[PDB]
């Protein structure tokens, strides 16, 4: 049973980043950090966490490909989304403090690390931050977020067919999910599950009527309709900036923040779509402190959770740490944890095991403590 098995420090200190898993390596793009420069034009960042060696590395800056042409790379930003389709990360949206509005689609090849901007057509969604993004086949679905130019919350779904690089504003059927940002959207099968987010209780505009959503909303991509859903007897507290992920056919949400309660979360909730029910799950081990807008990525039966923001022990801190949630700990994993906890001498273990023990107890060198 599920257990927090790794807690490492010294990684990128980031919140409101976006990340994808490519096999056993997590690629993390951009994000915000207090005290660092989000006004002057800089290149976005790529850090890679290897979930086997448990090491963070950072890619070097993008160089100009031809003399006289600027490097092809998104500017540093936060609040953007990243999805993976085959060998390509699609990065879209987000913002910085200064450069107003960017709705340019960026593609990043996970093998060559080259960036490019595919030529798109159709109804390009307006620039925004805090939207969700997910994929089904070659289609990327953008929902929600806070539109910069229109200055409002969105409840549109824009789909990008990457086979033709064509955007479409979906004319949906059913009752749409409330305009919101910093929600999640997770594909299970052909259905998109929208949970949480900050919203306004009367409409799409800030009006000092801010609410935190917790009624799950479901979009069927086949009929392009929002579904009427049954109530559930139990449900998580409303929150924004949780992480969501789909594992073994079920939706999981972790952490986040509710501004009405002024509460950060480190709970874990499981939504089973077949029975259509919520359950709160208690992993073994300590796990992360309550926080918001971390990223979570799935590697096999493990979740890599890293970064985010939490109240300092405005007095907020941004996180450089990383946690692994193991849904199915092997006996070897359980024994490694016991050997570490009991402080036993490791010098008579074979070197393959000692390498693993070292991996799980050694910080990376991206950051030092603040």
């Amino acid at each position: 049973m599920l257990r927090w098995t790794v807690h490492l420090e010294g990684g990128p200190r980031r919140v409101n980043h976006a990340a994808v898993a490519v096999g056993h390596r997590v690629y993390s793009f951009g994000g915000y950090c207090s005290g660092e420069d989000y006004e002057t034009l800089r290149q976005i960042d790529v850090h890679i966490f290897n979930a086997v060696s448990l090491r963070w590395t950072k890619l070097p800056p993008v160089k100009s490909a031809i003399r006289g042409q600027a490097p092809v790379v998104p500017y540093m930003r936060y609040g953007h989304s990243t999805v993976l389709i085959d060998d390509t990360v699609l990065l879209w949206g987000g913002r910085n403090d200064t450069e107003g509005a960017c709705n340019v689609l960026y593609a990043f090849d996970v093998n060559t690390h080259k960036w490019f901007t595919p030529r798109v057509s159709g109804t390009v969604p307006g620039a925004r931050d805090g939207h969700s993004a997910c994929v089904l086949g070659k289609i990327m679905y953008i929902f929600g977020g806070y539109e910069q130019q229109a200055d409002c919350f969105s409840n549109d779904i824009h789909k990008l067919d990457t086979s033709t690089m064509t955007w479409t504003l979906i004319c949906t059927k059913g009752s749409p999910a409330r305009w919101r940002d910093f929600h999640s959207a997770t594909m299970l099968g052909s259905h998109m599950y929208v949970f949480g987010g900050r919203a306004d209780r009367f409409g799409p505009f800030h009006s000092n009527n801010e609410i935190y959503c917790n009624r799950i909303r479901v979009f069927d991509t086949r009929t392009e309709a929002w579904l009427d859903c049954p109530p559930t007897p139990v449900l998580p507290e409303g929150r924004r900036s949780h992480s969501a992920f789909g594992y073994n056919g079920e939706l999981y949400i972790f952490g986040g923040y509710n501004a009405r309660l002024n509460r950060h979360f480190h709970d874990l909730w499981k939504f089973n779509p077949v029975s259509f029910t919520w359950k709160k799950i208690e992993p073994k081990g300590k796990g992360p402190c309550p926080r918001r807008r971390q990223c979570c990525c799935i590697v096999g039966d493990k979740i890599v959770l890293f970064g985010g923001t939490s109240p300092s022990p405005f007095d907020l801190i941004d996180h450089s740490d990383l946690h692994i949630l193991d849904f199915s700990p092997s006996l070897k994993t359980l024994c490694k944890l016991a050997v570490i906890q009991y402080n036993l001498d490791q010098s008579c273990l074979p070197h393959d095991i000692r390498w693993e023990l070292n991996a799980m107890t050694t910080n990376s060198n991206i950051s030092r403590p603040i």
Binding site: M1, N248, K270, K279, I281, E282, K284, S328, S330, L331, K332, L334, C335, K336, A338, V339, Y342, L344, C348, L349, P350, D352, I353
Partner: protein, 98 residues
């Protein structure tokens, strides 16, 4: 194959466990499917010359626990590992790929 298999410790204890449970170990799974393990040449038993009974008994309990609680989502007791066995149990789990 047979519903049960026999795992023998270095000190000659015989542990009889469900084959499905023993397959929690990648090593045992490979042994049970080793060359010639077919028809009446199939032994249904494995001899661990280097794992003593106090370790192999705990390994078998881990098999039972893992199969029982796979996909469980309710609060369950953890798997207990005493300090005096942790190093040996770690080496056995590494050898057994479990």
């Amino acid at each position: 194959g047979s519903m049960y298999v026999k795992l023998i410790s270095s000190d000659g204890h015989e542990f009889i466990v469900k084959r499905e449970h023993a397959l929690t170990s990648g090593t045992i799974k490979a042994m049970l499917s080793g060359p010639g393990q077919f028809a009446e040449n199939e032994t249904n038993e494995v001899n661990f010359r280097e794992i003593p009974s106090h370790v192999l008994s705990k390994v078998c309990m881990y098999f039972t626990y893992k199969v029982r609680y796979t996909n469980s989502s309710t609060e369950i007791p953890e798997f207990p590992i005493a300090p005096e066995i942790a190093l040996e149990l770690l080496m056995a789990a590494n050898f057994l790929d479990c």
